Design a protein around this ligand. Structure first.
Ligand SMILES: COc1ccc(C(=O)C2CCNCC2)cc1
Ligand SMILES: [Cl-]
Ligand SMILES: [Zn+2]
Ligand SMILES: [Zn+2]
Length: 574
């Protein structure tokens, strides 16, 4: 408790000795409260380039409401039963060994961390310096890092404090997490090749093919149960099974990694603002509070473990979670060794999201271990059987569904899709402020190129993508603040051919496509089912008069070099 967190707490008390107070009206039952101190301080902006080129959507509330802008955290999960705890440790032990068979844990470097900040990436960071890039150049910072680092080697912590607002941390604390645990993401531990269930680094153009491959296995329905607030349901037992990755480590790395797990994950200190504005300093040992990238990999690991145990329950490998016999342990260990890898291949798991094609439908009612691990399903009664999907083209995964689309030459594309209002509503939103017109244009171009690559099969998005790329200067580089092949100035037809034909392991015939007109759409009715405005007067006027909207945006940006991409479509090709 205060042993491990005291130093961090006692250091904060002293920076604010002129405001410390043990408020007794603090609204915390499940978090331990420590004190408060004086504080005072703190939305989504519209992308004008995308909005001017999507005029019909100005009157669609599902689009326009998206731009307008927590009991879960204050909850406590019960400790699982002894049989549940045994299933989790055995499975976790086996799963780290499988993930480790072809990978070597290793420390990530200042050099690697330095390049990541320059390329700009969401590091959930939070004042001698201003931006992240400037701090990385100043050897003073690194001296601060050294102090905390040597402290971690002693089994102690001083500065590793979370700032709830998503848990942000100072850049140095993020470095120390990336040093110890960055290998999981940097070296693709959760790749499909290495983990069999995982999809890290696969791409939205590969997810559909991956789900279609799972569908080809003999078994029951496909199950895609979402968990209610996954991060809040992570138990100290989960955090201890995750820590077992340190058993594959050595030397310094092992001690630095053990300290991240012990000092910042299994014991946490958080500063949370309260309007009543008095920064509350609370602590708790459970729940998910890591960097967003380490959170992804440990979420994937623990979800893979949970789903293998639900498959064991459905197969009758064990009968009760209250206690595991010596013979039930023999059977679980022998199931893992005998069919473990085949059962991981029956799943697609991305952090807290999963699709499972179990051996049969007994899985649907195998709920005792899943509920007892605290991974309670979203929007279904705790003891009601799961509703499975009979058609892989209906299964939800990573906020998408997937269509089978046949090209005029018989080759088969499996394409990602979601409700088109969600796609247009997200492209009309820009994060943060101080954006120039040029920067706003380059962000609209990034959305346009993603649409050309991923959602070319949606009539409205191919037309809007062509319009935005015609409206933005041809040489301006897409920016942004899932493999991102759209972040390039290369011609989008050449990128389309590389992604969908050349590099696509499910396409045997490598014949390049010569024009956009060879690249097919969904059926007209399927396009409308997934939110197309085709057949509306508003949409027909927009399409017919698109050159006028393109010319409005060109006039705003000014006298620049533009390309007309509209004749790449049949209806504008004279
Ligand atoms: C570009 O592709 C299009 C666009 C619009 C139409 C229509 O006007 C609708 C389509 C659905 N059935 C009623 C008529 C058809 C094809
Ligand atoms: Cl279905
Ligand atoms: Zn620390
Ligand atoms: Zn669709």
């Amino acid at each position: 408790n205060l042993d491990i967190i005291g130093k961090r707490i006692e250091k904060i008390k002293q920076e604010h000795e002129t405001s410390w107070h043990y408020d007794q009206d603090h609204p915390y039952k499940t978090w331990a409260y420590h004190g408060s101190y004086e504080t005072k301080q703190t939305s989504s902006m519209v992308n004008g380039v995308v909005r001017l080129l999507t005029k019909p959507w100005d009157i669609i509330p599902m689009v326009t409401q998206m731009a307008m802008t927590k009991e879960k955290v204050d909850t406590r999960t019960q400790e699982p039963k002894e049989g549940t705890k045994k299933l989790m440790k055995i499975t976790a032990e086996w799963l780290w060994k499988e993930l480790g068979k072809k990978k070597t844990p290793r420390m990530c470097t200042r050099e690697e961390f330095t390049r990541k900040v320059r390329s700009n990436a969401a590091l959930g960071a939070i004042n001698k310096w201003k931006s992240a890039r400037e701090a990385v150049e100043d050897s003073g910072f690194w001296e601060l890092v050294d102090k905390e680092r040597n402290l971690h080697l002693e089994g102690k912590c001083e500065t590793c404090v979370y700032n709830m607002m998503i848990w942000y941390m100072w850049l140095g604390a993020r470095f120390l997490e990336f040093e110890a645990l960055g290998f999981l993401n940097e070296d693709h531990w959760f790749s499909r090749e290495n983990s069999l269930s995982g999809v890290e680094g696969e791409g939205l153009h590969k997810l559909g093919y991956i789900l279609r491959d799972v569908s080809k296995k003999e078994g029951g329905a496909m199950y895609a149960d979402d968990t209610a607030g996954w991060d809040t349901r992570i138990t100290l037992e989960d955090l201890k099974n995750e820590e077992m990755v340190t058993n594959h480590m050595e030397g310094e790395h092992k001690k630095l990694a053990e300290a991240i797990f012990k000092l910042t994950y299994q014991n946490k200190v958080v500063r949370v603002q309260r309007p009543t504005t008095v920064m509350d300093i609370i602590s708790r040992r459970d729940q998910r509070g890591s960097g967003q990238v380490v959170t992804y990999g440990l979420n994937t690991f623990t979800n893979m473990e949970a789903q293998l145990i639900r498959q064991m329950e459905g197969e009758g490998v064990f009968k009760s979670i209250q206690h595991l016999t010596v013979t039930e342990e023999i059977a679980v260990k022998n199931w893992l060794v005998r069919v473990g890898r085949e059962r991981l291949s029956r799943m697609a798991i991305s952090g807290d999201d999963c699709v499972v094609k179990p051996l049969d439908d007994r899985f649907a009612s195998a709920l005792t271990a899943l509920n007892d691990m605290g991974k309670v399903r979203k929007d279904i009664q705790q003891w009601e059987p799961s509703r499975g999907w009979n058609d892989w083209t209906q299964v939800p995964f990573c906020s998408h569904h997937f269509h089978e689309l046949i090209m005029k030459d018989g080759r088969v594309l499996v394409v990602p899709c979601r409700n088109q209002d969600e796609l247009i509503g997200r492209a009309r939103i820009s994060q943060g402020a101080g954006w120039s017109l040029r920067e706003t244009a380059c962000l609209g171009k990034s959305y346009a190129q993603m649409w050309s690559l991923m959602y070319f099969h949606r009539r409205d998005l191919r037309l809007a993508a062509n319009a935005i790329c015609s409206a933005v200067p041809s040489h301006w580089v897409p920016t942004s603040r899932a493999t991102h092949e759209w972040m390039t100035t290369e011609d989008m037809l050449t990128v389309w051919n590389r992604v969908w034909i050349q590099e696509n392991p499910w396409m045997e015939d490598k014949t390049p496509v010569e024009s956009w007109e060879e690249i097919p759409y969904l059926g007209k009715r399927e396009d409308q089912w997934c939110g197309s405005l085709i057949g509306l007067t508003s949409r027909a006027t927009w399409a017919k008069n698109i050159q006028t909207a393109i010319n409005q945006v060109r006039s705003l940006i000014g006298n620049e070099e533009y390309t007309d991409y509209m004749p790449s479509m049949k209806r504008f090709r004279r």
